[PDB]
Paper text:
When DNA damage occurs, PARP1 senses and binds to the site of Single-strand breaks (SSBs) and becomes catalytically activated. Previous studies have been reported that inhibition of PARP1 leads to synthetic lethality in some BRCA1/2 mutant cancers (including ovarian and breast cancer), which could be specifically targeted by PARP1 inhibitors.
These previous work had well described that PARP inhibitors occupy the nicotinamide pocket in the NAD+ binding site of PARP1, forming key hydrogen bonds and π-π interactions. Subsequently, Top100 (PA-1 ~ PA-100) hits were further determined by CDOCKER protocol and selected for co-crystallization screening. In this study, we have described the discovery and identification of a potent and highly effective PARP1 inhibitor OL-1 (compound 33e) with a new chemical skeleton.
Author numbering:
A (entry chain A), B (entry chain B): 0 to 350
Write the structure that this text describes.
């Protein structure tokens, strides 16, 4: 037999469970596949890499030992064998290169999760590869009818909240999905009637979604460095679709992007303007909001599900002083999130 | 007519007002005294630079390339011209670049005042150069007696809290001064009975004190960038004496230094492990305490003026994954500072 699932859902399955995507991703980070193939990648290898980053974090603040900073930077490339050709490997000596690497490792973690879930579970040849992988995702994925007003709303969300400055592309909705991950309905219960609930985007690289649908969105591991993530070890969302759409890291080769809508229990937002690395919040606040100059228009806010959907146009909130152009909201407890809709998108680049 | 004041107070006045020390301190910041002499300084000149730093802060955080950020780095040097040997103008393009040039302007502002005071007054050849300048400070400086228990309290507090990581030099007390700025006790009235009030170290470069005694301690202006300081714009402190003493920035060429002892209404503390650039606390909080790896023994505290004087030996606090070797405290409200003692110290080096 062959799969009897909806056709766009099948396409989605072959997208996130894609080997050549995974091998290509490691090459984008200029990694030696001969010394380190996809098979020999592991979970703790990365945890160790994270500790190397945590080491450098401490090394910079806790005194001035720039000698060691090299030896650890060099040790990183030993841990994760790269192949730049003739070019110099970028020195890990500051906040930029630190931040740079954690994002890779976060992706590497998700690829290990994906390939482990691919080789995980059961051998059943009499079924189809698609049905098998679907059942491994632990997620009911329904195609949303493009008529349904929720779709129209979703379109009006994306349509308006494309920011002007991110001019390199423009967007359109290929496929929408009503995902339901097993357990998250119960996990989200304690924050269900917490005040100030907003539907927000989470953008991510195609392949990660295998891990993002099986295990949900997670906080960085204990090994990870807090300085590597601007606001710290939480989970990052945006109200503008373009902001998250950049975190799809779409290319000319890979123009199709996946992005999520998610119900987040924010409540009392620790309103901030600049970087502030932290593991936990003060007694009172339940989340952070990085305030940006541009923002979705507040008068155009609405309520589907009894939840806020700010889909107004980008307007200049009179925000004196900020490192961020656009807004972003961050919660630091994984239960505070409930995922709703997954959107396959098309990035048509300009010339 | 010669002065009525004590010898120690006279040598103190001279030291801070020594113009040649100011001229000298500006050279350490690579300032060109041809294009930017001491006389040609002004308040807005420096505040204009702060705005341009604040503009780079964003340029840096958003990863604008070396060809783009070029213009902003030269814009800064345009305002404040520098003496670069025979070099090309060094590119300002990271956190430290900012942090370094931020701590510069602080001084430039504090030095401006000193030069502004020497000149902004009435001269009189009959009256003493010193006494006239003592008037300018608006401070009732009194020489502490060597025996009085308060002297012996300070001696031990200084004696014990010299950190092992800063042992390249070793300090000894020369002079101690009980001080009271005019009106400063009026400012403290609301906070004088607040819970958790401590006496803490605050050491700045010799040349700044004129402005500190005149204006009181000060937070950075509105124009300044928040990312120039580890915990944003405020009033920093320390419970370890060597830590604060390092910002006197003494050397073999200038082994004389000054350092303060201010009462601080910490109250409810927002404890933190890592860099958190802010200009406003979470509600309920009054001060910030950086969680140090090392702490003055909790059981070795005593009361003077009903204030918590922390003068124990150095021990491990028992904190994992922190960026601070020792506690540094930051209040974000001028009103929560009251100055009590100013010490003159010889920095005896191990050359
Ligand atoms: C003139 N006044 C306002 C100086 C402020 C106080 C300090 C200081 C002193 C002791 C411990 C920490 C800090 C914080 C950092 C810092 C950086 C540069 C210059 C001074 C300072």
């Amino acid at each position: 037999m062959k799969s009897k699932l909806p056709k766009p859902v099948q396409d989605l399955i072959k997208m996130i469970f894609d080997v050549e995507s995974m091998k290509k991703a490691m090459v984008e980070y200029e990694i030696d596949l001969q010394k380190m193939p996809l098979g020999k990648l592991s979970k703790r290898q990365i945890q160790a890499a994270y500790s190397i980053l945590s080491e450098v974090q401490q090394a910079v603040s806790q005194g001035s030992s720039d000698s060691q900073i090299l030896d650890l930077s060099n040790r990183f490339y030993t841990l994760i064998p790269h192949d730049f050709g003739m070019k110099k490997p970028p020195l890990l000596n500051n906040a930029d290169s630190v931040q740079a690497k954690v994002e890779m490792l976060d992706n590497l973690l998700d690829i290990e999760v994906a390939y482990s879930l691919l080789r995980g579970g059961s051998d059943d040849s009499s079924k189809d590869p698609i049905d098998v992988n679907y059942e491994k995702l632990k997620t009911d994925i329904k195609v949303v009818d493009r008529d349904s007003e929720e779709a129209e709303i979703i379109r009006k969300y994306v349509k308006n909240t494309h920011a002007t400055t991110h001019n390199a592309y423009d967007l359109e909705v290929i496929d929408i999905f009503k995902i339901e991950r097993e357990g998250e309905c119960q996990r989200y219960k304690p924050f269900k009637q917490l005040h100030n609930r907003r539907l927000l985007w989470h953008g991510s690289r195609t392949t990660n979604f295998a891990g993002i649908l099986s295990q949900g969105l997670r906080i960085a591991p204990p090994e990870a460095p807090v300085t590597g993530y601007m606001f710290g070890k939480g989970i990052y969302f945006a109200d503008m679709v373009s902001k998250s759409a950049n975190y799809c890291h779409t290319s000319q080769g890979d123009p199709i992007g996946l992005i999520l809508l998610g119900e987040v229990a924010l409540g009392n937002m620790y309103e901030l303007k600049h970087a502030s690395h932290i593991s936990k919040l003060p007694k009172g606040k339940h989340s952070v909001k990085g305030l940006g100059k541009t923002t979705p228009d507040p008068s155009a806010n609405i309520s589907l599900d009894g939840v806020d959907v700010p889909l107004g146009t980008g307007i200049s909130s009179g925000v004196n002083d900020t490192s961020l152009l656009y807004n972003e909201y961050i919660v630091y407890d994984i239960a505070q999130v409930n995922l709703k809709y997954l959107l396959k998108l098309k990035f048509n680049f300009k010339t």
